[PDB]
Design a protein around this ligand. Structure first.
Ligand SMILES: Nc1ncnc2c1ncn2[C@@H]1O[C@H](COP(=O)(O)OP(=O)(O)OP(=O)(O)O)[C@@H](O)[C@H]1O
Ligand SMILES: Nc1ncnc2c1ncn2[C@@H]1O[C@H](COP(=O)(O)OP(=O)(O)OP(=O)(O)O)[C@@H](O)[C@H]1O
Ligand SMILES: [Mg+2]
Ligand SMILES: [Mg+2]
Length: 115
DNA sequence: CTGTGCTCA
């Protein structure tokens, strides 16, 4: 598991914009995107705003900030909502969820921007 | 594969 994070975090950081997380919400919240994705990125709410599934709320937000070119997982973990299953995961592990979700989300974005 | 998630084949 830890080796799967190690190979992802190397490819994600080499594709990252190199900006700290404070720039992610600062550059998105000053724009005029739909209020739904804006409410999540500006950290004002989470999946509870739209009553969406906790996994889908983290899925749509991770893909969106990847369209802005941000890719580094250290920011994915920092913005990760504390109301998610990543809070306690009594039958799970937070790193298992984080490795699976970013592996899938990154695969979908990088294949969308491939050339 | 794992709890499943998209947008787009
Ligand atoms: N619409 C909802 N969105 C988010 N959480 C919900 C919702 N309805 C109930 N919950 C609560 O949050 C957890 C998820 O319930 P739900 O039945 O939505 O499961 P799920 O759709 O398989 O997973 P998740 O929505 O957590 O990705 C449960 O503890 C439940 O009590
Ligand atoms: N019979 C079961 N009843 C409940 N959960 C089960 C069962 N079998 C497997 N599970 C796993 O346990 C999970 C629910 O407990 P878990 O503590 O992991 O989540 P949570 O309590 O909703 O989130 P958090 O622990 O972050 O608050 C389910 O999503 C599922 O993956
Ligand atoms: Mg749900
Ligand atoms: Mg729990």
């Amino acid at each position: 598991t830890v080796v799967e994070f190690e190979e992802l975090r190397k490819e994600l950081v080499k594709r990252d914009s190199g900006k700290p997380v404070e720039k992610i919400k600062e550059e998105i919240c000053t724009k005029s995107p739909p209020k739904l994705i804006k409410e999540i990125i500006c950290e004002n709410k989470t999946y509870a705003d739209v009553n969406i599934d906790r996994s889908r709320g983290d899925w749509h937000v991770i893909l969106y900030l990847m369209k802005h070119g941000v890719t580094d997982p250290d920011k994915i973990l920092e913005l990760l909502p504390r109301d998610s299953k990543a809070k306690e995961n009594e039958k799970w592990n937070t790193q298992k969820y984080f490795v699976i979700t970013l592996s899938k989300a990154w695969s979908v974005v990088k294949k969308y921007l491939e050339a």
